[PDB]
Design a protein around this ligand. Structure first.
Ligand SMILES: Cc1ncc(C[n+]2csc(CCO)c2C)c(N)n1
Ligand SMILES: [Mg+2]
Ligand SMILES: [Mg+2]
Length: 214
């Protein structure tokens, strides 16, 4: 099953959620995010955070449209989003997808990025999504990707430590059992030259950004 979380970032950086709706995909709203869900026509099963960020009318509008909507509050020491993720990881879905993850405040995004770290610990696919990016972290292993018709760039960035024996295949910029040192931006702006591409490394935490220039 799939769980989709919509955090409270600005709506303009968020994709069409509609096309992400499916019979095996539950939704949950976080902060303004639950408001975003209602506008799109999706009702959250649960909602996390408080209302000090949502408007008077906005609250009424939610209540009218979702009376039995339960809202779990945070403890100021854990982000609303951060809290929603525990609820979702617990459910153990094959995939968690988060939206409203980018915005004006950089801290916001930088945070969400750390959230992905909690996902490798639980070996559960956690993909972050916005209008032009798909972020995902991977532990050592061997992974396949398909060419993306709308986003042509695929970047790789080391996380906790150095990346060991990184191999890229089906990419414009190949790599064979390469050692990527922490902080390196060599593996940014790559592309797929085939229909399927493969990448793999033996040690470290790798980040993968698939993007577009619009
Ligand atoms: C493994 C690997 N991946 C991507 C690039 C290409 N690249 C690196 S930096 C950048 C943007 C600035 O030119 C681009 C396109 C490479 N050389 N090696
Ligand atoms: Mg929208
Ligand atoms: Mg708050």
């Amino acid at each position: 099953k799939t769980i989709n979380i919509v955090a409270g970032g600005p709506k303009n950086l968020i994709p069409d959620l509609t096309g992400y709706t499916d019979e095996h995909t539950l939704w949950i709203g976080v902060d303004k995010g639950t408001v975003t869900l209602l506008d799109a026509g999706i009702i959250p099963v649960e909602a996390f955070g408080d209302f000090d960020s949502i408007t008077e009318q906005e609250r009424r509008r939610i209540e009218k449209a979702a009376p039995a909507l339960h809202v779990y509050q945070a403890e100021k020491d854990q982000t609303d989003l951060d809290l929603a993720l525990d609820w979702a990881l617990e459910k153990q879905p094959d995939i968690i997808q988060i939206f409203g993850i980018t915005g004006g405040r950089a801290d916001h995004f930088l945070g969400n990025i750390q959230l992905l770290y909690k996902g490798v610990k639980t070996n559960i696919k956690i993909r972050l999504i916005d209008k032009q990016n798909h972020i995902q972290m991977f532990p050592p292993g061997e992974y396949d990707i398909e060419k993306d018709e709308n986003k042509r760039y695929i970047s790789f960035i080391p996380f906790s430590e150095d990346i060991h024996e990184l191999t890229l295949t089906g990419f414009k910029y190949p790599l064979n059992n390469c050692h990527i040192t922490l902080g390196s931006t060599l593996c940014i702006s790559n592309e797929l030259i085939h229909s399927r591409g493969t990448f793999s490394f033996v040690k470290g935490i790798l980040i993968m950004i698939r993007s577009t220039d619009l």
